Design a protein around this ligand. Structure first.
Ligand code: S3P
Ligand code: CL
Ligand code: CL
Ligand code: MG
Ligand code: MG
Ligand code: MG
Length: 169
């Protein structure tokens, strides 16, 4: 089972923190989005476009539950995985790190040409605030440690992480 599970919105640092936290703890990183593409042979975008979000969430839930059982390092969950009650259920008892980010920073950090079915222009900032508003309680419900990525250098938020895992609370 994973040493840590990372949850948060797109732009919250899951891939980069994942990377730094993993190096720090000395294990591998798995991203569930990558795992979905591997198992299905399909792009995330294609699944949403052709089969739709609900089918994506079912696939995602199965991949996440498997990953929680089978992987021993750091696991990063796609930003919408916590909307699935079965995912929240499976997270019970794990160490779960919520990477908190404000809308402005999150919006800035997601503004490239990455394909994002749920965060595509125009009015991306409105869409991001909507996701935040809906998902905030769900991240909070599952998380065992929260870290602020808004201002801190990454390598730092991670110190908060490696240090935190280690001592009581
Ligand atoms: O907000 C979402 O529902 C999604 C976030 C993405 O994960 P990241 O947060 O890893 O980009 C990816 O799973 C997909 O585009 C759906
Ligand atoms: Cl790494
Ligand atoms: Cl899901
Ligand atoms: Mg980096
Ligand atoms: Mg893809
Ligand atoms: Mg299916």
């Amino acid at each position: 089972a994973p040493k840590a599970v990372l949850v948060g919105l797109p732009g919250s640092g899951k891939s980069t923190i994942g990377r730094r936290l993993a190096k720090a703890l000395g294990v591998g990183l798995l991203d569930t989005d990558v795992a979905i593409e591997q198992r299905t042979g399909r792009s995330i975008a294609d699944i949403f476009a052709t089969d739709g979000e609900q089918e994506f969430r079912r696939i995602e839930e199965d991949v996440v539950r498997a990953a929680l059982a089978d992987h021993d390092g750091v696991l990063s969950l796609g930003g919408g995985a916590v909307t699935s009650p079965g995912v929240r259920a499976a997270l019970a008892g794990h160490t779960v790190v919520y990477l908190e980010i404000s809308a402005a920073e999150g919006v800035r950090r997601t503004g490239g040409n990455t394909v994002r079915p749920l965060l595509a222009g125009p009015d991306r900032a409105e869409k991001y605030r909507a996701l935040m508003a809906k998902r905030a309680p769900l991240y909070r419900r599952v998380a065992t440690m929260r870290v602020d990525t808004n201002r801190r250098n990454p390598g730092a938020v991670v110190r908060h992480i490696l240090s935190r895992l280690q001592v009581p609370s």
